[PDB]
């Protein structure tokens, strides 16, 4: 995020970190949508121009986090991926159309003050909230600057 604030504790309890096993480090954001389902951008998993091509065994999801770098003991839960899915019509070649992937966790995550799922929109909530000029909120541990 460029030009944002520090989140407050508990502010975004569905915020997930995709974390690389191989050289241990942040891949991407993601979001917790049930006790076993995490949602992310397909391009975090598969993006050929960039050699980005990750499987289950390359990835940990880290849920409950505030700090980017530390292992938040007693607060975070680290899960392992059972099954990754990428939209079949995901256009990585052109314009990243349908940039979405579902990640299924091995064991359920237990909810807490710091870990809790976001809702997914119904047609009607989309219908009334998805309009020009209505504000939305984005959250992440990505670069503060371009470079």
């Amino acid at each position: 995020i460029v030009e944002g604030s520090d989140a407050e504790i508990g502010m975004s309890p569905w915020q997930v970190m995709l974390f690389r096993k191989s050289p241990q480090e942040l891949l991407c954001g993601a979001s917790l949508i049930s006790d076993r389902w995490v949602l992310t951008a397909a391009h975090c998993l598969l993006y050929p121009p960039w050699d980005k091509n990750f499987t289950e065994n390359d990835l940990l999801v880290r849920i409950g986090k505030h700090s980017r770098t530390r292992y938040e003991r007693n607060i975070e839960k680290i899960s392992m991926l059972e099954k990754i899915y990428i939209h079949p019509r995901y256009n990585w070649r052109e314009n990243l159309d349908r940039d979405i992937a579902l990640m299924k966790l091995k064991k359920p995550v237990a909810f807490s003050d710091y870990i809790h799922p976001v809702c997914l929109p119904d047609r009607e909530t989309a219908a009334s909230l998805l309009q020009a000029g209505y504000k939305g909120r984005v959250t992440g541990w990505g670069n503060l600057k371009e470079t």
Partner: peptide, 10 residues
């Protein structure tokens, strides 16, 4: 800069 995470997570 990423603090080592427990070994139990393989």
């Amino acid at each position: 800069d990423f603090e080592e995470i427990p070994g139990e997570y393989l």
